[PDB]
């Protein structure tokens, strides 16, 4: 930049004019086979719409997301990507987790049957049976009613959805855990569903 001061009227001066970030998230094994199976449908949304270099250290069973200083745009893209892969790891379907990418207001809440009420062995198995319902009819009813996705792990149960929606889903699920039969629970679901549809 060539350079000289010019002194204007009243003698005043005048001149002229003149970060890569990383994250790591591990994958359990029983969720490591399907990750390979549906991997080819996973990295395209990460790289094309988020501009986010990806990798899978299969020598440490982790997925590493790093954002380039120049190519990426949105700062939060990195965190949304980490959350998306994390949900897929916890055991959600790929398209569901993609929804978690698409929006910005989808969360995941987890808890456990012993967190609600201390159940031992065969009681706990019966309680998970009552949550699932025959052929998953109950869980599917809840998901369709409150517009969320529920996954039972062995005992951990995870719920993806909007905040108030997952609150309602948790509410019904906890009633099921304590022991209200699925008939009464389904009745309550249809009531809240009618109210939510009218609103």
């Amino acid at each position: 930049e060539s350079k000289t001061v010019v002194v204007d009227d009243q003698g005043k001066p005048r001149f002229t004019s003149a970060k890569f970030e990383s994250r790591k998230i591990m994958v359990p094994p029983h969720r490591m086979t399907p990750l390979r199976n549906s991997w080819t449908k996973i990295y395209p949304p990460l790289v094309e719409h988020l501009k986010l270099q990806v990798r899978m250290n299969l020598k440490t069973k982790s997925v590493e997301l790093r954002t380039n200083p120049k190519f990426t745009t949105d700062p939060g893209a990195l965190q949304k990507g980490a959350d998306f892969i994390k949900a897929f790891t916890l055991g959600f379907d790929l398209d569901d987790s993609i929804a978690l990418l698409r929006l910005d207001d989808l969360y995941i809440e987890t808890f456990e049957v012993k967190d609600v009420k201390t159940l031992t062995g065969d009681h706990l198995s019966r309680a998970i049976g009552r949550i699932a319902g025959k052929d998953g009819k109950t869980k599917f009813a809840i998901e369709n009613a409150t517009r969320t996705r529920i996954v039972l792990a062995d005992s951990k149960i995870h719920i993806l959805g909007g905040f108030t929606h997952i609150r309602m889903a948790r509410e019904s699920v906890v009633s099921l855990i304590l022991g209200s039969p699925p008939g009464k629970v389904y009745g309550n679901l249809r009531t809240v569903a009618s109210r939510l549809k009218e609103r």
Partner: protein, 240 residues
């Protein structure tokens, strides 16, 4: 709530006016780690003031920072371990720190514990040659052979007890022959657990052998000379 309808409790009677400007009255100190690790300069901390050098020295004699060996050493593969350093001698903006403890990360512990194998936890209390009473927890998991067909790899209580005895005697022999600086130098590149494996290789094939945790319990009489040597004097500028 800061809402209008959140009715006043006994509560908001007499407040105090924000005039102190705390992070203008405060001050910045930088710390340094012992000479075993590779990056010795890690972060900075804050001291309430300097009007009481009593306050400055006392705060920084109580401090204890806690870093991750990845940050400390440059290799990202020590991500799961995490050490605790405590600073005890301070000089000229610059704090001298020594080893104080170890741990893993809860993620790594949950990651290692799987369902179709046995867990073994060994627990030994010892003292180094430096007179640092210490407590070490080790873990191991009974892995399975290359031609397993059995779903699980469970060890008998006999094999468990034998492996616990071997681990205890190895840990205590190592950290009684060692010194604390030498202890960290051993504990960095995962060598005690290489020994544990290489010793238990005939009882039962194990995996994920790790020195889970180290705990200080007693410390000897202080030694500023030892600290300065471990880290590997000054004049002023004639103010008038």
């Amino acid at each position: 709530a800061v809402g209008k309808n959140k009715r006043l409790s006994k509560g908001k009677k007499g407040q105090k006016k924000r005039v102190v400007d705390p992070f203008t009255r405060k001050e910045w100190f930088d710390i340094k780690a012992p000479s075993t690790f590779e990056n010795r300069n890690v972060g900075k901390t804050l001291v309430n003031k300097s009007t009481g050098l009593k306050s400055a020295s006392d705060a920084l004699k109580g401090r204890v920072v806690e870093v991750c060996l990845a940050d400390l050493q440059g290799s990202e593969d020590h991500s799961f371990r995490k050490i605790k350093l405590r600073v005890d001698e301070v000089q000229g903006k610059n704090l001298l720190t020594n080893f104080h403890g170890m741990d893993f990360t809860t993620d790594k512990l949950r990651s290692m514990v799987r369902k179709w194998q046995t867990l073994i936890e060994a627990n030994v209390t010892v003292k180094t040659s430096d007179d640092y009473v210490l407590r070490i927890f080790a873990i191991a998991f009974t892995r399975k052979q290359a031609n397993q067909v059995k779903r699980h790899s469970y060890a008998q209580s006999s094999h468990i007890r034998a492996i616990r005895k071997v681990i205890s005697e190895i840990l205590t022999k190592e950290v009684q022959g060692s010194t604390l600086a030498q202890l960290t130098s051993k504990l960095i590149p995962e060598v005690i657990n290489k020994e544990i494996e290489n010793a238990t290789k005939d009882i039962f094939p194990l995996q994920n052998i790790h020195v889970r945790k180290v705990k200080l319990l007693k410390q000897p009489k202080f030694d500023v000379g030892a600290l300065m040597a471990l880290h590997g004097e000054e004049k002023g500028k004639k103010v008038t």
